[PDB]
TrEMBL record:
Gene3D superfamilies, A to Z: Hexapeptide repeat proteins (2.160.10.10)
One Pfam family it belongs to: Hexapep
Protein's UniProt name: Acetyltransferase/acyltransferase
InterPro entries hit by this protein: Hexapep, LbH_gamma_CA-like, Transf_Hexapept/Carb_Anhydrase, Trimer_LpxA-like_sf
Annotated signal sequence range: none
Organism: Bacillus cereus (strain ATCC 14579 / DSM 31 / CCUG 7414 / JCM 2152 / NBRC 15305 / NCIMB 9373 / NCTC 2599 / NRRL B-3711)
Lineage: Bacteria, Bacillati, Bacillota, Bacilli, Bacillales
Top-rank lineage group of the source organism: Bacteria
Transmembrane domains' residue ranges: none
Amino acid sequence: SNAMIYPYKEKKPKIASSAFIADYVTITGDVYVGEESSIWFNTVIRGDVSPTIIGDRVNVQDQCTLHQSPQYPLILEDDVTVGHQVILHSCHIKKDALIGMGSIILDGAEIGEGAFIGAGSLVSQGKKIPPNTLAFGRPAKVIRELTAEDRKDMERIRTQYVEKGQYYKSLQ
């Protein structure tokens, strides 16, 4: 509510009316944020190099940094979860994926649909993580296929975040 929204040149952020934008968040420039998505406390999204497209029901948790290099956009597809203090840099995170807290996902990296990146990981430039796998480490490596139980916990997290986003939004 106490958040900064700036243009960068002729572009201004386009944020769905149902999205929750927490306090101390800064969003600038060429950024699009979809319905019921939630951008948590002290996150910075500077849209001043390439476009940042965030889909629907996405959570970008507290104190993340979202930026780009010139060659690639930054894309977070629908139903993505991004953990606390994650750095995203011109990567493409496909739908239902989860990025573990404290991770760094670099330029041209592709996180497959429903993949889970373990906390504290570094996904190097150009790295592809296959859909429905667990990957972790620095640099991150594919560890195993995800199970039905892993997927149920991911569903719990993304759905609860939508609800919690709407709740904290109501307190603004």
